[PDB]
């Protein structure tokens, strides 16, 4: 289950990311869906930098998700 | 363990440059210009799917958010259950 | 010629006509007979500037005797104009059918002189070969043997010349004799078509891609030819399948779908095996599923997509996760596939991994050793492949630990230990996990 | 404007060419089965 | 403008007629097959 439920959760996360991208940037999405694994000691700084960078798309206007697993 | 204990998903449009560093590319964004220097940062190859109606898209997004919350709670419970048994961190029982 | 409708072909014809010279000057320079030169000049004036009619044979004879590059270009331009003219061309075609020597002279003039002149001469030769009476297997073989024509077709820089050659070959491919000639010359034709398809997958380019797709479909119309091409160009077939979804043109997508279906048609030898191999290695099933969900402007394209989706579903009906893992191991590539992530596959197929004296484990160890040898590049794809291989090895070691001794004997344990020096953080974590699975906790 | 019509004709030509190839194959298969019975 | 669309429909109709000609080729093959049977009967 720790593998199957995790895989299903990641599939749901990907589908939600695609839905958010098509809702925000329109159809087609053409969004650079990327996963960033920030080090634990700089999670807050990475989040702040991402928020600052997402301002050009104007919760932040850009589709952003936080996962701790 | 793994390289990092946290993951950040970004779905910014490809045609939009980062606000902090205008004119920067995806590599520059992944670098110190718009990141802290994450080694495992890579693109997620989400597959294509039917678009549907805009209202249908919004309903699907709400349902996906609810499902994500529920399955995150379920995964947390499963992780707690697995950590509650000492045999989880071994090769026992094949 | 039919291929002359292309913009590149029209530009080549215009360039050739710009270099044309009057036949009167050739007659004055004793390069041709006065009567033949006058007839050629009258024909040129009537066509593009009074048709010569039966006087085309002496004009062609004088052109063959005329060794001047300008005279040859003018003759080629006049022949092309006569072929394009509604009134002209029929007499020349009849003369070529009655006299094969004129066809031989036209073929000899093809792929000679300037690029525009060579293109015009080749177009004239193709138009002559378009007639059923003048068509000949020997003429097609001689045209295929032309090294200059092959170089022009394969010339990536000469986009116009390559497109014109591709269009001419596609137009000629309708003739079964020309189809057999193309089958014989496949050894040189296939790399050029594959390169063109790869460049397209990365206007004149659209027309060239359409001509290449039409030629591929014509070649795949025959079952033996399609079966031979599929085996020799499996990577090209996968690239074409990917470009079918990548391309947005309805005609190009329909042509690619038809080409894929012809290769997957039951008339081809080992059709089921070829279809299964394509669906496994090239991930054809998800692409066909996406195409079915997609929309196209051509009903024939929709029917071809439906047929391809049905074939892919039939192939994947008997597929299995263990089969996918075996195919990935055979391909010596890995990108963290769900079989390598879901514990179900790594648990059910664990027993099969140790089968045949742990053949799967030995193959994985060899792949890991090869990646370690090639790990100096530290490429992102290479790093991902190395991480996937390390995860697979760790899984196959933790489950059914009887293979630990085999891995140690084969040197896989030593390679895994040495891989801990890799600078990649993911590679370092994978090496630490492997070491923990070895003796650690 | 006329380019679209010309392009459509080229696509139809491929369809006609494909139909001709299919017709010859079907005719050969039908003839071969009948010839074997006659033989 | 609309002339190109009309020509496209006419071109598509031409392909359908050529597609319909496949049945004629099969019927012609049957007549060709009967010729071989007649030739074989002559040999007999």
UniProtKB/Swiss-Prot annotation, chain C:
It is found in: Vacuole membrane. GO terms for cellular component: fungal-type vacuole membrane; Golgi membrane; proton-transporting V-type ATPase complex; vacuolar proton-transporting V-type ATPase complex; vacuolar proton-transporting V-type ATPase, V1 domain. Disruption phenotype: Increases the ATPase activity of membrane-detached V-ATPase V1. Abolishes growth at pH 7.5 and in the presence of calcium chloride, abrogates growth at pH 5.0. One of its GO terms (biological process) is proton transmembrane transport. Keywords: Hydrogen ion transport, Ion transport, Membrane, Transport, Vacuole. Its main location: membrane. Pfam families: V-ATPase_H_C (PF11698), V-ATPase_H_N (PF03224). It comes from the Eukaryota. GO terms for molecular function: proton-transporting ATPase activity, rotational mechanism. It is a peripheral membrane protein. The keyword Chloroplast does not apply. V-ATPase is a heteromultimeric enzyme composed of a peripheral catalytic V1 complex (components A to H) attached to an integral membrane V0 proton pore complex (components: a, c, c', c'', d, e, f and VOA1). Interacts with YND1. Subunit of the V1 complex of vacuolar(H+)-ATPase (V-ATPase), a multisubunit enzyme composed of a peripheral complex (V1) that hydrolyzes ATP and a membrane integral complex (V0) that translocates protons. V-ATPase is responsible for acidifying and maintaining the pH of intracellular compartments. This subunit is essential for activity, but not assembly, of the enzyme complex. This subunit is also required for silencing the ATPase activity of V-ATPase when V1 is detached from V0. Belongs to the V-ATPase H subunit family. Present with 22500 molecules/cell in log phase SD medium. PANTHER family: V-TYPE PROTON ATPASE SUBUNIT H. This is V-type proton ATPase subunit H. It comes from Saccharomyces cerevisiae (strain ATCC 204508 / S288c).
């Amino acid at each position: 289950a720790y593998v199957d439920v995790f895989i299903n959760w990641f599939h749901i996360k990907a589908l939600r990311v695609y839905v958010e991208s098509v809702l925000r940037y329109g159809l087609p999405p053409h969004f650079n869906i990327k996963i960033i694994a920030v080090p634990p000691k700089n999670l807050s700084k990475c989040k702040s930098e991402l928020i600052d960078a997402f301002g050009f798309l104007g919760y932040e206007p850009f589709v952003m998700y936080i996962i701790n697993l | 363990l793994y390289t990092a204990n946290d993951f950040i998903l970004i779905s910014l449009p490809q045609n939009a440059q980062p606000v902090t560093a205008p004119g920067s590319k995806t590599d520059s964004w992944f670098n110190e210009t718009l990141i802290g220097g994450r080694a495992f940062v890579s693109d997620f190859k989400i597959p294509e799917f039917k678009i549907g109606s805009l209202d249908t898209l919004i309903v699907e997004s709400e349902e996906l958010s609810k499902v994500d919350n529920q399955i995150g709670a379920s995964i947390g419970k499963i992780i707690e259950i697995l950590q509650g048994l000492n045999e989880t961190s071994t090769n026992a029982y094949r | 010629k039919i291929l002359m409708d292309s913009t590149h072909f029209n530009e080549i014809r215009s360039i050739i006509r710009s270099r044309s010279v009057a036949w009167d000057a050739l007659a004055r320079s004793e390069e041709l007979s006065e009567i033949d030169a006058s007839t050629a000049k009258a024909l040129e004036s009537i066509l593009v500037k009074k048709v010569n009619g039966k006087t085309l044979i002496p004009l062609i004879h004088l052109l063959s005797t005329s060794d001047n590059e300008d005279c040859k270009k003018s003759v080629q331009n006049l022949i092309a104009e006569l072929l394009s003219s509604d009134k002209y061309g029929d007499d020349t075609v009849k003369f070529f059918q009655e006299d094969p020597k004129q066809l031989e002279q036209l073929f000899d003039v093809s792929l000679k002189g300037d690029f525009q002149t060579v293109l015009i001469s080749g177009f004239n030769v193709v138009s002559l070969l378009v007639q059923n009476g003048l068509h000949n297997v020997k003429l097609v073989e001689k045209l295929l043997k032309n090294n200059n024509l092959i170089n022009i077709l394969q010339n990536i820089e000469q986009m116009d010349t390559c497109y014109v050659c591709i269009r001419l070959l596609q137009e000629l491919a309708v003739i079964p004799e020309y189809r057999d000639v193309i089958w014989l010359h496949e050894k040189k034709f296939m790399p050029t078509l594959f390169k063109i398809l790869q460049r397209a997958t990365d206007h004149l380019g659209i027309q060239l891609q359409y001509h290449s797709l039409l030629l591929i479909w014509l070649l795949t119309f025959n079952p033996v030819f399609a079966n031979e091409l599929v085996q020799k160009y499996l990577s090209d077939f996968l690239d074409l399948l990917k470009l079918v979804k990548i391309t947005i043109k309805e005609k190009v997508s329909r042509l690619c779908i038809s080409i894929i279906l012809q290769c997957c048609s039951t008339r081809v030898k080992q059709h089921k095996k070829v279809i299964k191999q394509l669906l496994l290695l090239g991930n054809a099933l998800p692409t066909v599923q996406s195409l079915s969900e997609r929309k196209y402007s051509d009903e024939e394209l929709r029917q071809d997509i439906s047929n391809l989706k049905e074939i892919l579903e039939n192939e994947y009906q008997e597929l299995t996760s263990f089969d996918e893992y075996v195919a990935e191991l055979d391909s010596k590539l890995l990108c963290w596939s769900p079989p390598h992530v879901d514990n179900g596959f790594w648990s059910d197929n664990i027993d099969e991994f140790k089968k045949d004296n742990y053949k799967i484990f030995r193959q994985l160890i060899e792949l890991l050793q090869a990646k370690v040898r090639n790990g100096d590049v530290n490429a992102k794809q290479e790093k991902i492949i190395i991480q996937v291989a390390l995860n697979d090895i760790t899984h196959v070691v933790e489950l059914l630990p009887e293979s630990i001794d085999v891995l140690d004997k084969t040197g896989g344990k030593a390679d895994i230990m040495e891989l801990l020096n890799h600078s990649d953080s993911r590679v370092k974590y994978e090496a630490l996990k492997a070491t923990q699975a070895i003796i650690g906790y | 404007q006329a380019f679209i019509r010309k392009e459509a004709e080229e696509k139809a030509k491929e369809i006609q060419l494909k139909a001709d190839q299919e017709y010859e194959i079907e005719k050969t298969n039908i003839v071969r089965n009948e010839t074997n019975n006659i033989d | 403008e609309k002339e190109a669309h009309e020509i496209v429909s006419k071109a598509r109709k031409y392909r359908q007629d050529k597609l319909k000609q496949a049945k004629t080729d099969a019927a012609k093959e049957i007549d060709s097959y009967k010729i071989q049977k007649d030739k074989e009967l002559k040999e007999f």
